[PDB]
Amino acid sequence: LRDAYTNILHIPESTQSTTVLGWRRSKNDSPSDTSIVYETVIHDNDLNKPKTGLSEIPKEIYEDVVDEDVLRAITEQQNFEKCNEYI
Amino acid sequence: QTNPVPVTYPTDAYIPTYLPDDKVSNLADLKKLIEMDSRLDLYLTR
Amino acid sequence: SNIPDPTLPPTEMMTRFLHPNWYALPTTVWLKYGNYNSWAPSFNENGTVVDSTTRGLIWLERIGYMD
Amino acid sequence: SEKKPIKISADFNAKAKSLGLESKFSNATKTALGDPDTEIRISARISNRINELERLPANLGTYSLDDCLEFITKDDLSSRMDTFKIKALVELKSLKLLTKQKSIRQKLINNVASQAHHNIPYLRDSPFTAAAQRSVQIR
Amino acid sequence: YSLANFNVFQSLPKETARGVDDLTRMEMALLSGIPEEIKWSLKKYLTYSNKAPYMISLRTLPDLLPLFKTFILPLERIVEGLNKSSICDSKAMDSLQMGLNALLILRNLAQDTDSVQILVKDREIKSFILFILKKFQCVATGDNKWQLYEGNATFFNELTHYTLDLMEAISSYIAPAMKDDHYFQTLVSILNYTKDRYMVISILRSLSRLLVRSKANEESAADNLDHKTLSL
Amino acid sequence: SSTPLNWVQGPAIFHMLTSPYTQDEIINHEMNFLKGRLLELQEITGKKITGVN
Amino acid sequence: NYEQEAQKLEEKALRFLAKQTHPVIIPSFASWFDISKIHEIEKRSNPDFFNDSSRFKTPKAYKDTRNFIINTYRLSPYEYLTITAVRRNVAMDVASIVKIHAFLEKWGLINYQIDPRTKPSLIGPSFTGHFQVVLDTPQGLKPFLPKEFPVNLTIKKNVYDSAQDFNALQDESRNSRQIHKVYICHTCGNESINVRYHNLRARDTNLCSRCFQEGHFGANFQSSDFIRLENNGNSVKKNWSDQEMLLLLEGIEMYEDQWEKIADHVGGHKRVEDCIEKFLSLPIEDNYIREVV
Amino acid sequence: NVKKEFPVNLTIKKNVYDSAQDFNALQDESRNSRQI
Amino acid sequence: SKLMECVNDAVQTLLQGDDK
Amino acid sequence: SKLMECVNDAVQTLLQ
Amino acid sequence: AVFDLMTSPFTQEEVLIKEIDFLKNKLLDLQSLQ
Amino acid sequence: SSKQNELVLQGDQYFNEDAARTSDIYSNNNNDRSLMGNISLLYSQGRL
Ligand SMILES: [Zn+2]
């Protein structure tokens, strides 16, 4: 939908990406090959498991009433999200 | 003369004051001698 | 063109070239007040790069022991 | 070998040499291109080469041995007749524009040296260069 | 060939064609925190203080002194830590050099009336000057508390000089010095110690300016001048 | 803007090709630059200067 | 299986990706800024959104508003992005909108007015490599899956020869042979096609192939005064043929210091910097210096 | 977060020791008395 | 000037250890 | 070669 | 020489006068040095 | 300090009329290109 106040397209934010997970750099094939290769890349560590707000619940809520396995699952989910926030 | 004539060799030097007073025992005598030399210079020039 | 022949002198490039790494930095001045004026300011170190004692040590190493 | 491998003395030219810093007290190094003899010799060689290049004929076509696939019929023009002529001209003109290249090179070198203390980090950041640049700006 | 060839683009001012006036550029660069911009802006500010100090006078441009103070107080901490080898890292050297540049800029500006009037009304700068003077006195009298490590002497040297110049200026605005004044004692100690000539003349001017409006019968700073100093 | 400002083409700052870090060459080239700039500005403005040598 | 999944994912991600057309320019002191992070300078200049004072002022709201403004500006960097448009789109109190807009404008992050056709282009230390900006994968485009599944796709690529090409946003694809040049026989008005016979003495008059075959030049010139050159032949970047080097030397001989005319005499498809570099790095004298020493 | 040398145009140059082996285009028709 | 590289490496190894 | 030998011998004598 | 566009509550005339004053004093000092 | 002083003492080695008269330091094959990279700027300033 083209908005007229700013004269600019508006697409649902889902189709767009949110953040930028750092950069990556390498070298050319030959020395003195002074060229720049700029390119974008998407990264989707463990696309099977969805993300939830579980990295936000403080420890002082779910603790002390949980099974060992559920505690391990909670920790795994939180660590998974935190690591997916990386490169 | 109205100016001190800049020269090429060092004309003086500080004496280090960070040496241990126990180990070096002849700094006081050297400073006394320097003071007496300054006094003699003052008296002669006056 | 006005370009001369490559065999005509001069032919050297860095004949009067001076790199900044040799530009004669400022140092102490070493004034001299007569002969019996010992209570007198000997140095004049206002815009120096290195202090007086280090300049004196440089002079001692390079010049004072040349003999 | 067994004992101390340095043996510092009171010379300061053997002492400085034994620890690596030998040329670091001279203004500029010693090179070979600074004598008029070598300059005269190089100039002689260059003049000889230019003489040889100029004594070549103008009509200096080249048969390229790949003209077989180009079925030339004594009326067409071979697309490679000027390949040795172009090289001869390039070499001759490059040999005649030597002083121009020298001048531009020395201009570049001077204009990049004068700004060493302002463009090179490890020179701009030493305490001595900073102290000197401060000393110049003392009001 | 290019969309700039519209009539609309025929009326652009000359003030923005470069992007930002250099004063604004230097201010924002100091505000950023990026070290390269900091060094560039400090070099430019120093050149301006030396060759055009009326464009950056501390009166016409307020909120200029706070930035210099932010660069100058860590210099106080460093100088306190200067009695041993403590400039091992390059960030330490960079902070020290930024402090020295800001101090020289302050001195060059203090060579003017409005700027020194603004500088006097600042407790931080006066406290820093007093701190450096007390360190110099500790070096001069040969105290065992704080002994300068000679590997740093160079730095200290420059430091001292700038400080004294500053003192000289502000010496006119603390004119009547009382009995137990630390400035006077520090200056007389340094005067009895030093062998520099620039330093001796500066100290004499500073002392003669700290005795402007003082009474003979009233107890003043002139009672801190023992017969040794007068004889000298 | 509570303080009206103007666009002021600032003053020429002395810039030497080779900065030699000592006062001799600097003072020579700087006296030359000062005299030249004084002449330029006296030509620009309707005024006169004293002590120009 | 997963191959088709990643293929469709790349297709969808490339379809809904914002293609850049205009270059964005910001002043150097605004180099601490990242679109996905908040800096200390932003928290000092905007203490109200982070001191937990109000509920209407949260760091999330501030970040969303400033990202809206940044994206809106970057998508059309030629316009001015008045405050009223933002206020009509964003749902904050007008004071906060104004403060954020003014803060972003002070640091040149938006509405930075230059005329970039009056400044040179340089090269930073970081240069000459492959740079991969890795941005998170968009949701609503992930596949529907009713074992791991990592993804490290690459959406679009761009190559540049110099930094000036990077700034002008000119890729090698279209830049290679963008336009052409026309030569005309000095004797007949007809234009020479695919080949011209350059006069080594006149250095300005070129001839048709036919007018050279039949000797239709002046009676003081011989056939040995002309040389065969090509017209449509452009060399790949950083590759100088012998014809181009000869033309460069002739241009330097004719126009001694007028490097625009020189670079045009070579054929125009090479910038002036390349001409100066090629003339500088030329082992003209190395053999004789080496054999004497 | 190699030495490229000037081309050695050997086909252009002449033999230094026995110049009777150059290509006929480079020879001088003056040693066999064929100038005029 | 090659001895000083070994000396610097020795000093670095000294800085690596703890009870040295 | 022998330089590393001398340096390591000196360091070992220093640390012992 | 280098010219830097700037902004100040002054005008061009007053700035030129201040520059004249400062440069005159500086030239007098440099002359008195020798 | 040793690393920094060694870096400083190696700042003027290619300024001796041997590196200047031969095409080595002007070649692009140099990994460090701190010399040729200036050309553009030097051309825009007209000094060159
Ligand atoms: Zn024709």
Side-chain angles (χ1 to χ4, degrees):
Chain A
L1 297 187
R2 173 255 177 182
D3 95 295
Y5 292 96
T6 58
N7 185 35
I8 258 178
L9 261 188
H10 285 0
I11 325 100
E13 203 270 353
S14 64
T15 74
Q16 305 299 320
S17 53
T18 66
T19 61
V20 181
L21 313 179
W23 294 65
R24 282 180 180 172
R25 189 180 181 180
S26 68
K27 303 177 181 178
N28 295 324
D29 303 0
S30 67
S32 163
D33 188 16
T34 57
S35 290
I36 350 169
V37 185
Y38 193 79
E39 56 182 2
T40 171
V41 156
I42 53 186
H43 175 69
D44 198 350
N45 260 346
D46 282 357
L47 166 51
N48 273 23
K49 289 185 176 181
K51 309 177 185 180
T52 55
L54 225 55
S55 61
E56 302 165 344
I57 293 89
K59 303 183 176 181
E60 297 81 313
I61 292 186
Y62 51 87
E63 279 177 351
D64 312 358
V65 271
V66 97
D67 317 337
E68 308 174 342
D69 315 9
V70 187
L71 190 63
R72 295 208 172 189
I74 289 179
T75 54
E76 284 202 22
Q77 179 82 331
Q78 299 198 31
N79 296 24
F80 157 68
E81 297 177 9
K82 292 184 178 181
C83 292
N84 209 327
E85 287 186 349
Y86 285 108
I87 48 178
Chain B
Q1 275 201 28
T2 49
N3 285 324
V5 188
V7 85
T8 58
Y9 57 94
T11 57
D12 204 8
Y14 294 100
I15 286 189
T17 52
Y18 44 79
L19 293 170
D21 292 323
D22 311 338
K23 326 297 293 181
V24 170
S25 55
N26 284 5
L27 256 188
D29 305 0
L30 190 59
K31 295 178 175 179
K32 290 175 180 175
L33 293 188
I34 291 179
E35 289 189 2
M36 263 313 302
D37 175 72
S38 183
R39 289 178 58 184
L40 291 179
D41 278 355
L42 262 175
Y43 193 91
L44 293 182
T45 40
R46 170 168 60 85
Chain C
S1 60
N2 313 332
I3 307 181
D5 189 283
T7 199
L8 303 179
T11 53
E12 302 79 3
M13 306 176 52
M14 295 177 158
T15 176
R16 317 173 323 275
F17 160 82
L18 244 67
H19 188 58
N21 276 26
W22 47 78
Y23 260 172
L25 309 177
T27 45
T28 329
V29 177
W30 293 328
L31 314 162
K32 182 184 178 185
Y33 287 74
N35 262 330
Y36 291 84
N37 306 336
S38 59
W39 67 100
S42 311
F43 316 116
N44 187 332
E45 34 187 2
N46 165 236
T48 65
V49 172
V50 79
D51 66 325
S52 63
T53 54
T54 312
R55 186 61 183 87
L57 294 186
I58 295 181
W59 178 90
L60 177 61
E61 299 293 339
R62 300 200 61 181
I63 303 295
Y65 292 154
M66 181 179 295
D67 304 311
Chain D
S1 55
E2 316 301 323
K3 45 188 175 179
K4 296 91 175 181
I6 295 185
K7 294 189 175 182
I8 278 179
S9 65
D11 171 60
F12 182 77
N13 279 328
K15 168 183 180 180
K17 178 185 178 180
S18 57
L19 287 170
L21 316 165
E22 195 271 341
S23 61
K24 263 62 177 183
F25 294 95
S26 65
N27 185 21
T29 78
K30 285 190 173 301
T31 55
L33 306 184
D35 295 331
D37 305 358
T38 67
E39 291 298 327
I40 291 178
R41 293 163 180 172
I42 293 185
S43 65
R45 297 297 293 176
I46 290 185
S47 64
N48 163 73
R49 185 74 186 111
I50 291 184
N51 170 88
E52 283 195 351
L53 274 174
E54 289 218 355
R55 264 63 176 185
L56 277 179
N59 47 344
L60 193 65
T62 122
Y63 197 93
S64 61
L65 193 80
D66 283 325
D67 301 0
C68 307
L69 308 181
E70 304 175 4
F71 307 98
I72 294 177
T73 67
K74 212 190 62 179
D75 299 7
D76 310 359
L77 305 169
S78 185
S79 61
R80 278 179 285 259
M81 285 302 296
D82 303 310
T83 70
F84 291 159
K85 195 178 181 179
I86 297 193
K87 293 181 178 178
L89 289 171
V90 165
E91 179 173 28
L92 179 58
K93 280 173 178 165
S94 67
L95 271 190
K96 276 180 173 175
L97 302 187
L98 191 50
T99 58
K100 181 60 178 177
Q101 190 190 35
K102 286 183 184 172
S103 70
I104 300 185
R105 278 181 168 181
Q106 95 164 353
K107 290 180 182 179
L108 172 86
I109 265 177
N110 290 2
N111 294 16
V112 93
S114 70
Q115 308 169 22
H117 294 340
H118 300 256
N119 294 333
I120 292 180
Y122 56 90
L123 285 176
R124 183 231 307 158
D125 302 6
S126 62
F128 299 135
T129 59
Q133 291 184 333
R134 255 186 271 104
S135 173
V136 174
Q137 311 286 161
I138 289 184
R139 180 181 178 183
Chain E
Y1 170 74
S2 60
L3 301 186
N5 292 338
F6 272 91
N7 303 271
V8 191
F9 285 141
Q10 284 183 339
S11 59
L12 314 184
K14 293 183 178 182
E15 325 309 312
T16 68
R18 43 177 47 188
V20 134
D21 53 310
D22 295 14
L23 282 175
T24 305
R25 194 177 225 88
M26 298 182 298
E27 181 178 1
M28 300 307 299
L30 275 185
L31 276 175
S32 343
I34 304 173
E36 299 299 321
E37 303 296 326
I38 286 183
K39 298 178 184 180
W40 174 87
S41 72
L42 280 189
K43 282 192 179 186
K44 260 249 180 175
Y45 262 152
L46 181 54
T47 53
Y48 263 102
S49 78
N50 177 39
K51 293 174 183 176
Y54 54 91
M55 300 297 299
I56 58 178
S57 70
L58 297 180
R59 162 174 294 190
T60 61
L61 292 172
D63 66 79
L64 236 186
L65 185 52
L67 308 177
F68 299 153
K69 296 202 300 181
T70 59
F71 283 101
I72 278 180
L73 306 184
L75 191 67
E76 173 189 71
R77 178 186 54 86
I78 295 175
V79 171
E80 187 169 8
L82 206 59
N83 65 328
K84 52 184 175 297
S85 186
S86 59
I87 315 293
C88 322
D89 194 4
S90 292
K91 290 191 178 181
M93 178 61 70
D94 291 9
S95 53
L96 176 71
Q97 296 299 328
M98 294 169 185
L100 293 187
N101 291 339
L103 189 57
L104 183 58
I105 293 175
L106 269 200
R107 122 88 147 89
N108 279 4
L109 289 184
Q111 244 52 44
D112 281 4
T113 63
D114 296 332
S115 303
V116 71
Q117 285 180 359
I118 300 302
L119 284 181
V120 166
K121 301 298 182 181
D122 196 325
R123 307 160 51 86
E124 312 290 344
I125 294 304
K126 296 172 66 177
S127 179
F128 175 76
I129 295 179
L130 181 53
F131 174 73
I132 301 302
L133 286 184
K134 297 187 75 59
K135 279 291 165 292
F136 201 172
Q137 175 191 0
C138 183
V139 175
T141 63
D143 279 1
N144 303 265
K145 310 179 307 178
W146 192 91
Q147 295 179 356
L148 177 71
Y149 179 84
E150 296 302 321
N152 319 116
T154 296
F155 309 141
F156 196 70
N157 179 39
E158 311 188 52
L159 195 81
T160 59
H161 281 65
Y162 300 153
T163 293
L164 282 192
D165 294 355
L166 277 176
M167 185 55 194
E168 183 180 345
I170 75 176
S171 66
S172 181
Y173 295 84
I174 330 173
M178 298 315 174
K179 172 85 170 190
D180 295 329
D181 191 6
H182 298 295
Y183 294 111
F184 210 90
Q185 306 176 358
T186 53
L187 288 180
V188 300
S189 297
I190 304 169
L191 176 64
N192 290 124
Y193 164 75
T194 187
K195 302 186 178 186
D196 195 338
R197 181 186 180 270
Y198 179 91
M199 191 143 301
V200 159
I201 296 187
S202 291
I203 291 175
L204 279 185
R205 287 172 187 161
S206 306
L207 288 188
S208 67
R209 291 179 187 177
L210 288 182
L211 297 178
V212 174
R213 291 118 56 189
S214 54
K215 332 293 180 183
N217 46 17
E218 173 180 342
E219 202 75 12
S220 174
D223 307 85
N224 298 334
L225 288 171
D226 41 334
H227 297 340
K228 180 180 178 183
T229 305
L230 291 177
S231 182
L232 176 59
Chain F
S1 65
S2 58
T3 60
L5 301 182
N6 310 321
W7 290 123
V8 173
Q9 315 191 33
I13 302 185
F14 180 48
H15 169 85
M16 193 183 310
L17 274 182
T18 77
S19 47
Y21 292 149
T22 45
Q23 295 289 344
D24 317 3
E25 337 178 9
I26 286 187
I27 199 189
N28 300 330
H29 293 243
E30 194 179 33
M31 292 176 65
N32 263 17
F33 154 79
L34 285 175
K35 296 175 181 177
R37 182 59 182 174
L38 280 178
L39 295 185
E40 292 180 340
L41 201 35
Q42 180 180 340
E43 292 179 10
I44 288 186
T45 53
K47 210 183 182 67
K48 292 297 167 297
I49 325 177
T50 61
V52 180
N53 304 323
Chain G
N1 190 24
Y2 285 179
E3 327 86 9
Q4 298 162 134
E5 297 278 37
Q7 194 62 221
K8 298 178 304 180
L9 185 53
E10 172 179 349
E11 296 278 11
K12 295 184 298 182
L14 179 56
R15 181 170 69 188
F16 288 111
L17 192 75
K19 332 287 185 186
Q20 183 172 19
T21 300
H22 322 268
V24 182
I25 315 175
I26 65 176
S28 303
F29 47 91
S31 304
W32 46 268
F33 175 80
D34 281 336
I35 320 185
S36 50
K37 293 188 171 186
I38 305 186
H39 197 19
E40 316 169 7
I41 313 179
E42 306 183 6
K43 302 195 177 187
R44 292 200 259 98
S45 304
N46 295 317
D48 319 82
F49 293 101
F50 310 91
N51 58 9
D52 209 332
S53 63
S54 176
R55 52 195 169 99
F56 305 90
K57 293 188 171 190
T58 62
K60 177 182 179 180
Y62 159 81
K63 185 168 177 176
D64 297 351
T65 302
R66 80 165 178 83
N67 286 23
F68 172 87
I69 300 179
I70 286 290
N71 296 323
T72 303
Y73 173 71
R74 297 268 181 85
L75 283 173
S76 69
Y78 49 86
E79 205 166 312
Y80 181 70
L81 184 55
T82 73
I83 285 182
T84 302
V86 179
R87 181 185 56 81
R88 294 298 299 177
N89 286 272
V90 190
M92 297 206 62
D93 48 307
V94 55
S96 307
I97 299 181
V98 167
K99 285 184 299 182
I100 292 180
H101 196 280
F103 166 68
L104 286 187
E105 191 157 349
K106 168 158 54 63
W107 292 87
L109 287 178
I110 70 180
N111 303 143
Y112 191 70
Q113 311 190 285
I114 353 172
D115 197 5
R117 40 188 177 86
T118 182
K119 307 179 69 80
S121 303
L122 313 182
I123 48 103
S126 177
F127 214 67
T128 69
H130 290 59
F131 296 97
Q132 296 187 339
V133 42
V134 176
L135 46 97
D136 182 13
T137 167
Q139 301 177 345
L141 300 190
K142 300 179 172 182
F144 190 17
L145 306 178
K147 197 169 188 176
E148 284 191 343
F149 195 174
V151 159
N152 204 316
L153 299 186
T154 297
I155 296 183
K156 63 178 303 183
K157 194 205 309 300
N158 287 318
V159 190
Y160 304 97
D161 279 317
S162 83
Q164 329 171 34
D165 317 318
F166 184 93
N167 300 8
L169 274 177
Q170 286 187 340
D171 192 1
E172 295 177 344
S173 70
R174 244 191 58 81
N175 187 26
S176 65
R177 193 51 173 277
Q178 235 155 343
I179 53 183
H180 61 292
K181 197 172 182 182
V182 173
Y183 303 86
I184 281 185
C185 171
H186 190 61
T187 57
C188 66
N190 292 3
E191 60 162 338
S192 53
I193 309 300
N194 296 325
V195 123
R196 65 193 194 274
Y197 280 89
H198 178 61
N199 189 313
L200 261 36
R201 307 226 306 269
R203 294 176 184 171
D204 297 68
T205 75
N206 312 26
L207 260 51
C208 291
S209 64
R210 182 159 187 176
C211 311
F212 175 79
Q213 288 182 24
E214 304 178 11
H216 289 322
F217 42 92
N220 55 317
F221 294 142
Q222 278 176 333
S223 65
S224 63
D225 297 324
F226 300 88
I227 208 167
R228 169 157 176 159
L229 308 180
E230 305 183 357
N231 301 333
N232 289 18
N234 81 306
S235 61
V236 187
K237 40 269 175 188
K238 316 303 176 181
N239 301 314
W240 288 65
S241 58
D242 271 324
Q243 154 181 348
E244 295 173 345
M245 205 176 311
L246 173 64
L247 286 185
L248 170 66
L249 297 177
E250 275 202 348
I252 295 182
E253 183 180 4
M254 297 192 300
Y255 324 109
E256 181 168 349
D257 287 321
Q258 318 176 43
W259 291 94
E260 46 155 356
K261 297 182 177 177
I262 299 183
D264 193 16
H265 190 66
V266 180
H269 59 76
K270 291 190 173 302
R271 49 170 68 263
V272 184
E273 297 79 12
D274 298 9
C275 301
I276 302 183
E277 293 176 15
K278 185 60 180 177
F279 179 63
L280 287 187
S281 63
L282 215 59
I284 298 179
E285 203 190 15
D286 291 3
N287 287 333
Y288 317 102
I289 300 176
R290 191 186 312 165
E291 63 182 299
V292 171
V293 188
Chain H
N1 311 317
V2 202
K3 298 184 177 181
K4 299 183 180 181
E5 185 192 353
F6 198 73
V8 188
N9 308 323
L10 284 181
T11 43
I12 288 178
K13 317 189 184 193
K14 300 181 182 178
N15 193 317
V16 196
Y17 308 108
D18 180 45
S19 59
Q21 300 171 25
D22 300 319
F23 303 94
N24 301 267
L26 305 185
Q27 293 176 8
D28 289 331
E29 302 179 9
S30 176
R31 298 164 179 167
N32 305 266
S33 299
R34 307 173 194 175
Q35 322 90 313
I36 303 186
Chain I
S1 66
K2 291 191 175 182
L3 171 62
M4 301 313 301
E5 302 187 14
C6 315
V7 169
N8 295 13
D9 297 5
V11 174
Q12 194 118 46
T13 55
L14 262 177
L15 281 182
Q16 292 176 12
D18 301 333
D19 305 359
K20 306 179 181 177
Chain J
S1 58
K2 290 192 177 182
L3 295 184
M4 300 288 294
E5 296 184 358
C6 298
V7 172
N8 300 329
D9 290 326
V11 173
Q12 286 181 353
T13 53
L14 174 67
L15 291 181
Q16 296 167 354
Chain K
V2 186
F3 297 99
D4 311 327
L5 222 307
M6 286 177 284
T7 169
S8 68
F10 295 152
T11 62
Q12 304 157 344
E13 318 166 0
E14 315 177 3
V15 168
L16 293 179
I17 296 179
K18 292 193 172 191
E19 180 178 359
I20 290 179
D21 305 324
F22 183 80
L23 296 188
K24 181 181 173 181
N25 281 334
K26 192 175 187 183
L27 181 55
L28 288 180
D29 294 4
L30 289 189
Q31 286 191 350
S32 62
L33 181 50
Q34 294 174 314
Chain L
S1 302
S2 300
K3 179 176 173 297
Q4 293 300 323
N5 290 335
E6 289 177 3
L7 266 178
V8 170
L9 289 176
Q10 297 175 355
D12 58 310
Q13 52 182 356
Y14 295 152
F15 291 92
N16 42 319
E17 187 131 38
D18 292 5
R21 248 184 163 187
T22 69
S23 170
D24 302 78
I25 75 180
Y26 313 86
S27 175
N28 47 327
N29 291 343
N30 281 16
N31 340 334
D32 54 331
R33 316 206 69 261
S34 59
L35 183 53
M36 309 303 288
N38 316 277
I39 285 178
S40 173
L41 175 59
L42 283 157
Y43 177 62
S44 302
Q45 300 182 2
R47 296 141 63 102
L48 194 48

